[PDB]
């Protein structure tokens, strides 16, 4: 009972590792530098800058709670 | 296109033959169902015979147009594509032996 569930939780952690990184890579990243931002809007599928920060903060919180 | 129309009349003939044998098989089925006890051997035997005559005629047609029927090949397209979503096609054109 207990032992199997904890086993499930560490499995849950690994899944969270790659899930998290993948989510972040998937969603908008364009950073202009000097120049002006420009996108391949279709392939990009951007997300809001604030949406980004909030989502990565959320992801950190979830992972630390898992630990 | 001449080969195509020759194959057309050929497969028309086989269509007619198979039509007639469907009618004879359905008739047989009806006579079977007609009486709750199984039917008398004379009559069923008679019907086996007519069935034989039908299938013999069919085999003759197929061997006569055997060359033109094994050169031609069947694929569905164009207008079936409206109903193409269905596996009915695969079941209808399947040539797996029983």
């Amino acid at each position: 009972c207990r032992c199997t569930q904890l086993q499930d939780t560490i499995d849950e952690v690994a899944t969270q590792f790659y899930s998290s990184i993948h989510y972040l890579s998937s969603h908008h990243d364009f950073v202009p530098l000097p120049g002006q931002e420009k996108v391949s809007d279709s392939k990009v599928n951007p997300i809001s800058a604030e949406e980004l920060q909030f989502a990565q903060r959320d992801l950190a919180k979830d992972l630390v709670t898992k630990f | 296109d001449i080969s195509t129309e020759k194959t057309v009349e050929s497969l028309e003939a086989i269509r007619h033959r198979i039509a007639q044998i469907v009618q004879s098989l359905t008739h047989f089925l009806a006579i079977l169902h007609q009486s709750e006890s199984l039917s008398p051997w004379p009559t069923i035997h008679k019907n086996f015979n007519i069935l034989l005559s039908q299938i013999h005629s069919l085999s003759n047609n197929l061997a006569a147009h055997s060359h033109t029927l094994q050169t031609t090949s069947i694929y569905p397209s164009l207008e079936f594509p409206v109903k193409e979503q269905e596996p009915l096609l695969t079941t209808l054109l399947r040539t797996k032996a029983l």
Partner: protein
């Protein structure tokens, strides 16, 4: 200095090779047409000479376009190399994700779960008592 970066060597035809094979093929085609010609009608001689002249001129033009575009070759090549690098960085991200999935798979392969003794005891008596009682 500008930072080292892989230089991309394949996918590229040296302009000198292109012009060389083009010269040599056009000349072969001339030699080849020069034998069929004495066996042909005069009107046909002319018709074939004409056709070759114009086809070969179209090819020469393709090479003229090439020659003019050449001056952008090093710039473009530099691009190609940069893109190569950046692609490699993306490949890095993806590749990591795949490795993480793979080790998660090995993870499910390594855990062990507490035995279903119930089913085992039922199978002592050679039936799956569960699947029978349950099922209508």
């Amino acid at each position: 200095e500008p930072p080292a970066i892989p230089h991309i060597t394949e996918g590229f035809y040296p302009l000198p090779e292109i012009v060389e094979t083009f010269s040599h093929h056009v000349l072969q085609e001339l030699v080849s047409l020069a034998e069929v010609l004495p066996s042909m009608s005069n009107v046909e001689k002319k018709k074939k000479i004409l056709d070759w002249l114009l086809r070969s001129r179209a090819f020469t033009m393709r090479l003229l376009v090439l020659a003019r575009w050449v001056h952008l070759s090093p710039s473009v090549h530099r691009c190609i190399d940069v893109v190569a690098f950046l692609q490699g960085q993306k490949f890095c991200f993806q590749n990591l994700v795949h490795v993480l999935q793979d080790i998660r798979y090995q993870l499910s392969f390594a855990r062990l779960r507490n035995s279903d003794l119930v089913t085992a005891l039922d199978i002592l008596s050679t039936g799956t008592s569960l699947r029978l009682a349950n099922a209508p």
